[PDB]
From Swiss-Prot, chains A, B:
Annotated protein name in UniProt: Vascular endothelial growth factor A, long form
Superkingdom to which the source organism belongs: Eukaryota
Induction: By hypoxia. Regulated by growth factors, cytokines, gonadotropins, nitric oxide, hypoglycemia and oncogenic mutations.
Organism: Homo sapiens (Human)
GO molecular function, one term: platelet-derived growth factor receptor binding
Glycosylated sites: N62
A biological-process GO annotation: positive regulation of blood vessel endothelial cell migration
Length: 94, 94
């Protein structure tokens, strides 16, 4: 049984590696098929213990990754794509 | 710049720590306010590279955690709640 305090600290609002789909990140590029289709990014997650508060980023950075993309029967390509990362989170009002 | 292979292995379907909301887990307990409102659980996530295959669990277990719950105007209660964990994932058809 995980003690209340472990669960409390571990789930509290903080940056956590999150597997994000590339389409949600670059939406004006659905006319391509990415591989991998998703990337591991550091994003604010978890909970604030108050309904009024929400977990949001207070410091960000960019990560560049080699992603493959292919237009329907038109050649395999490999390029760089940048994604926004969260280095620090904070519980604040909505 | 993260190399294509690093990104590919890291994002590929596997059990990863995910911060889940307790209501999502116990939709009947909407009557209570849990603290923490969310818990860290091992769940299948990531991607299968072929949108035909989907990342799903092939081995599970239960985790028990001490969670506090309170009814409006009543006292704080502390108890145990069990959540479903994923020990192994696998890419498969829909």
């Amino acid at each position: 049984v995980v003690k209340f305090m472990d669960v409390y600290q571990r789930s509290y609002c903080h940056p956590i590696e999150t597997l994000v789909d590339i389409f949600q990140e670059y939406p004006d590029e659905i006319e391509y098929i990415f591989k991998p289709s998703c990337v591991p990014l550091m994003r604010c997650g978890g909970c604030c213990n108050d309904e009024g508060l929400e977990c949001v980023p207070t410091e960000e950075s960019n990560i560049t990754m080699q992603i493959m993309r292919i237009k329907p029967h038109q050649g395999q390509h490999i390029g760089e794509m940048s994604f926004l990362q969260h280095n620090k989170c904070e519980c604040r009002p909505k």
